[PDB]
Design a protein around this ligand. Structure first.
Ligand code: ACP
Ligand code: ACP
Ligand code: 573
Ligand code: 573
Ligand code: MG
Ligand code: MG
Lengths: 286, 270, 260, 285
């Protein structure tokens, strides 16, 4: 893979430090997603980033977005990956307003299996779970992306621009703890955002919850650290769902459910067993 | 007037809004707003950035040359041969002598002194926006966040915090005031620049959690580890760095005082 | 506005009506030491500044501001290094041909810029071309410069076009006159001499160049000057005003040539 | 340094003149600064060449004290003349009496002869501003081309506003002291009439008693020479001036012939209160 090898089709989206293009890899004819991340970095570490990304060639799971290759040109590391024509659940949540508890069930399974896959077969945690990083497609697949595989790339990304919100767990915000337990919190927070259809920090006021200038990021972080976790509204959701997000959002990581415990959860047993035209729901909402 | 009639500019390569190497009475730098329908917010951004540059004529401010509207919104400035301070310090690890490092400090201060003297707060000072032109002359650039201090406290209103975190002062991060920027916030950024100059590394190299740094710096827990200054760093510089980096903004020196500190230092070696 | 308030500029070593000053670092102050500003001296100052304010180009001396209240003064960047005159004619710096062409090129670049903004420099010569840090050309001294729309003739004879000397045309100064000046500069660059060295009478040079009789001796150019540069010198020095190239074309020729 | 400035005597084209005193001496002199950016071998050559001025001894030549270089300029320290130049004097007198022009004429001829015979040098620069006078009544020639290298270095110059250059020097043909006679003649007409005689006065402009330099050069080369008017000047004077202003140097008067002209023989006999006339015109009275 190299920069000449590609033809731009369209811009799939952009973030805080990265841009994603739907492209056609000329030699193979393949349509793929090309992610460019701007970095000013020493040749020795760019080459270390590439080399470390090559581990994705082995990462094969239906809960993990596929990897075609990686390279550096001009001023930018390129990651070429499985194009997901459904987009990110962030994009979806915009068009769908709120995601039905029953679909979120499939999503919750997909996330857990993928976090399990990463953990066990590749020794790594995600680091960055949130709606924009769960990708869905026509065939009803829900895959995870943008996880922390290259340790060097993690390091090189630390010199970054300021975000506008955050899904970081409180224990990470305090440097108190660092494990999969933190990715569980982020899944928890994501779910609440996807369920209610609005980023749950801070919580909605009494009036605002009836319908259903932005808080600066430092205030958001200070909230997460010092305030009780968000939670689902009382009636609109099953008690099993409310209980599920709750065990994901416990401030103290120790007391927070783990992947084994979550997997056999009432909400997961139910949803696994349910059969939902997920692929159908997806295309119908686009 | 500094409007460049359409057609004259000849956009070429790309580097990193978005910046191209172009042609207009010689090599120039062209910074464009790629898109096609400029929102009135992107418009006022442009109007403001041009407004600030127009007031600058100093050898350490990167030379504004003119602007274009018709093809796309764009700002034209002098072209620079040679790299950013970021690039020297963290990429090609240029082995500057301490007298040179002090001089880079000195010039950077000189450009900042000149801006503050005309009431411009840069708001995005950092290694990348400091160019060693022909390896000999510091030119401060990128005035995309620059602003002029308004005499009246209610003109401010709401602006979403943006910028590189490693150079943001704790009060800016916290973002508790209507306007947390000040000449002093620029000084803090320059403080981090002293850090890169006297140490060779960015701050917080053991921490790679972006949100954690924002949270710990804003809270007072985290601050640069001054022990990492190289041993040839004059004691006066270490002190001056620690002063620019004070958490209580009012405790930070301003640029004339910073300039004096460096002159007085310079006066001390043979 | 670019007025520097009284109190800030601090003047130092004279160089002679230009001093070295401090205002946000090293600067150069050009003053008018008379406390009787002739209404014509005030007019002079007003226009020089008015011309300078239009310039923002890396090959034009950077104007920084003006002061009226201790005295009439113009603040511009302070350049370290020497003028092209001093190099060619005094210390006889032995530039390589590429560096000569580069000095010619940058000079042209700045002239191109001035012209595109309808500024006629009217006093372009070696002395007024400063090699900043020995590598970047900074075209200075704008004391005769005007913006193209009676004046007693004023200047240095060796760089004056024969129509300038003659003073018989309705508009004796033109973009093309600056080009002639430029051609003389080319001459100095490619011979390392001034023109008309075999003639030491000012009034003879004035009269004979004006009449059309006298012209730089092109035999003196260095053996290593490209045929193409020598040709360009010719076109620039042409006696007939309208037969001279304009700076777009000059720049083109030099940039083209420089590639060989 | 060691010269205290007393006043400024004036300035012209590439040079300025101060009346100074040598600090320990109390020796009053005239110091001329000529602005030059020249190679150091060339400033040394000029200073060396100026030293032949020490060999100049004539009551028709301004005295010379010394020369040296400093701060991008050549200093020529020379005898102070408290009467200044005839250029300066002319301004305050309006016209200069014919009888006085007789004495100037002699001085200039005597001076140009001394320079020619004793040093083999022509003046090259005769005009009223280079004829200096004093209160003892002497009349002396200044600013003559003694250093050939200084001549060369002064070519790179600013345009003037006028010229006393002989037509043959202008067209670059052969020239000699004949050129200097032309200039004396041109200066004599200026001083007598009180107006630079190029071009000659209009009908209106005349009864009372600018022009680009290129026009003036062209007048000098292609028009007839100026002349005095008749009646108000002696016929001998008019004859004298005319013989100086002939365009052909070869049909023009020479030094030997002027020395014995009627206007000269006469004025030499005349006894005139020159010093009295001068102090009267300026500032000792
Ligand atoms: N493999 C893929 N297929 C299709 N679309 C993709 C994709 N990967 C990313 N995208 C889209 O590109 C957009 C930009 O992704 P990127 O990761 O750069 O920013 P982001 O939305 O995740 C927020 P941040 O940069 O702050 O983490 C995402 O919203 C996603 O919709
Ligand atoms: N030795 C001397 N004593 C007194 N006055 C002198 C002098 N030498 C020169 N001056 C005066 O100084 C003035 C300036 O001298 P300078 O020779 O530079 O100017 P100038 O009047 O001859 C004009 P230009 O340079 O165009 O020939 C003269 O007009 C003369 O009156
Ligand atoms: C702000 C950034 O611009 C976008 O977010 N982060 C990433 O895209 C990202 O962060 C990473 C990391 F810290 C270590 N290794 C890889 C990655 C990776 N990109 C990425 C990962 C997996 C797959 I499959 C595809 C990808 F593009
Ligand atoms: C540049 C001045 O504004 C014009 O005056 N020019 C001169 O004064 C001048 O030009 C010269 C030259 F070409 C060769 N040698 C000497 C001189 C000389 N000066 C001079 C000569 C004699 C004496 I006694 C005193 C002088 F100052
Ligand atoms: Mg993403
Ligand atoms: Mg004189």
């Amino acid at each position: 893979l190299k920069d000449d090898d590609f033809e731009k089709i369209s811009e799939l989206g952009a973030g805080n430090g990265g841009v994603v293009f739907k492209v056609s890899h000329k030699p193979s004819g393949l349509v793929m997603a090309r992610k460019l991340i701007h970095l000013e970095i020493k040749p020795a570490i760019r080459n270390q980033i590439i080399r470390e990304l090559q581990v994705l060639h082995e990462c094969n799971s239906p809960y993990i977005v596929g990897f075609y290759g990686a390279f550096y040109s001009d001023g930018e590391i390129s990651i070429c990956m499985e194009h997901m024509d459904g987009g990110s659940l962030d994009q979806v949540l915009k068009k769908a307003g709120r995601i039905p508890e029953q679909i979120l069930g499939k999503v919750s399974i997909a996330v857990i299996k993928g976090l399990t896959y990463l953990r066990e077969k590749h020794k790594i945690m995600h680091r960055d779970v949130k709606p924009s990083n769960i990708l869905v497609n026509s065939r009803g697949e829900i895959k995870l992306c943008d996880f922390g595989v290259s340790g060097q790339l993690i390091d090189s990304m630390a010199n970054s621009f300021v975000g506008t919100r955050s899904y970081m767990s409180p224990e990470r915000l305090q440097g108190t703890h660092y494990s999969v337990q933190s990715d569980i919190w982020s899944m928890g927070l994501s779910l609440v955002e996807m369920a209610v259809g609005r980023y749950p920090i801070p919580p909605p006021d009494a009036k605002e919850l009836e319908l259903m200038p932005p808080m600066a990021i430092f205030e958001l972080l200070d909230y997460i650290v010092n305030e009780p976790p968000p939670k689902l509204p009382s009636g609109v959701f099953s008690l099993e769902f409310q209980d599920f997000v709750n065990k994901c959002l416990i401030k103290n990581p120790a007391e927070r459910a783990d992947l084994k415990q979550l997997m056999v959860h009432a909400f997961i047993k139910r949803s696994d067993a349910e059969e939902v035209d997920f692929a159908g729901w997806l295309c119908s909402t686009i | 007037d500094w409007e460049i009639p359409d057609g004259q500019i000849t956009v070429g390569q790309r580097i990193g809004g978005t910046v191209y190497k172009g042609k207009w009475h010689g090599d120039v730098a062209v910074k464009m707003l790629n898109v096609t329908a400029p929102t009135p917010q992107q418009l006022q951004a442009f109007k403001n950035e041009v407004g600030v540059l127009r007031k600058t004529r100093h050898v350490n401010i990167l030379l504004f040359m003119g602007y274009s509207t018709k093809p796309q919104l764009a700002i034209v400035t002098q072209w620079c041969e040679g790299s950013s301070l970021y690039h020297h310090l963290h990429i090609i690890e240029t082995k500057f002598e301490m007298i040179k490092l002090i001089d880079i400090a000195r010039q950077t201060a000189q450009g900042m002194d000149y801006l503050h003297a005309k009431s411009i707060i840069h708001r995005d000072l950092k290694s990348n926006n400091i160019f060693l032109h022909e390896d000999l002359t510091v030119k401060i650039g990128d005035f995309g966040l620059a602003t002029v201090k308004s005499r009246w406290s209610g003109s401010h209103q709401f602006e979403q915090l943006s910028g590189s975190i490693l150079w943001m002062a704790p009060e800016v991060i916290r973002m508790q005031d209507k306007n947390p920027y000040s000449f002093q916030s620029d000084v803090y950024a320059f403080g981090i620049v002293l850090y890169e100059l006297m140490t060779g590394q960015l701050p917080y190299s053991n921490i790679n959690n972006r949100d954690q740094i924002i949270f710990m710096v804003g809270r007072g827990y985290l601050s640069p580890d001054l022990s990492k200054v190289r041993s040839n760093c004059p004691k006066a510089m270490k002190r001056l760095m620690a002063e620019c980096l004070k958490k209580k903004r009012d405790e930070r020196p301003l640029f004339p005082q910073i300039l004096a500190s460096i002159e007085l230092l310079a006066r001390s070696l043979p």
